[PDB]
Amino acid sequence: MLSQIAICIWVESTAILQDCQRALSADRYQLQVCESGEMLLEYAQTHRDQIDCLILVAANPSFRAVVQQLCFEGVVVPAIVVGDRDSEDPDEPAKEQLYHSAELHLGIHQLEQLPYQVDAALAEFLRLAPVETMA
């Protein structure tokens, strides 16, 4: 069976870290918070497979750079992204370069679907896995 799910989130804000993990509180969740983005690389650099879902916040400036390394080393996981506009405006349609095509998106005030999203992110990533992580 499945023992637990490994989720590595990267967020420098406790509220975001708490709301992102709060939803992901299932008894089978292993949330790992990364104080930085480089720290997340070391964690994903030695257990990509052990990671079941990565949480990322686009609100960060060099966040994409940190994600590029995950894709750079080939670390691809059902990564849920936070921070997406809710307008169909073509100026900011939310590009999918934050991570790979398997990454899922989560509204900033929608912190709660992470658990259900994780299950969707896992299935969405497995079907697409291996995903295209050209960063």
Side-chain angles (χ1 to χ4, degrees):
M1 69 217 87
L2 196 122
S3 268
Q4 292 192 299
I5 300 167
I7 304 191
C8 181
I9 176 174
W10 170 26
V11 62
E12 284 192 78
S13 208
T14 329
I16 295 171
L17 156 274
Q18 287 174 246
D19 290 22
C20 289
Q21 287 193 158
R22 160 236 183 163
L24 299 178
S25 67
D27 311 50
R28 67 182 161 166
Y29 270 141
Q30 176 197 159
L31 315 194
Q32 203 302 315
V33 189
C34 276
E35 299 183 354
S36 14
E38 279 183 0
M39 277 190 66
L40 166 54
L41 303 172
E42 269 148 341
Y43 165 102
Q45 271 167 7
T46 79
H47 270 148
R48 331 191 202 196
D49 191 352
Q50 306 303 300
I51 316 328
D52 270 30
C53 222
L54 175 80
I55 303 170
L56 287 183
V57 179
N60 269 103
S62 62
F63 149 63
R64 272 74 72 80
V66 169
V67 181
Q68 103 186 26
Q69 287 295 8
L70 270 135
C71 298
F72 190 100
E73 306 207 51
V75 189
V76 201
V77 283
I80 310 172
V81 188
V82 194
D84 190 12
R85 283 287 289 204
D86 296 306
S87 275
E88 67 216 51
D89 211 71
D91 284 64
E92 270 180 323
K95 307 188 189 271
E96 294 190 345
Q97 73 182 154
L98 296 185
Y99 205 163
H100 43 258
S101 207
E103 81 186 84
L104 256 66
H105 302 166
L106 179 67
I108 294 164
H109 67 92
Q110 283 231 98
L111 282 242
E112 51 185 327
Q113 288 178 99
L114 289 115
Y116 119 64
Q117 285 268 326
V118 155
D119 295 301
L122 300 154
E124 188 60 41
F125 180 104
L126 293 181
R127 192 185 301 281
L128 270 57
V131 192
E132 309 196 285
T133 29
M134 298 193 296

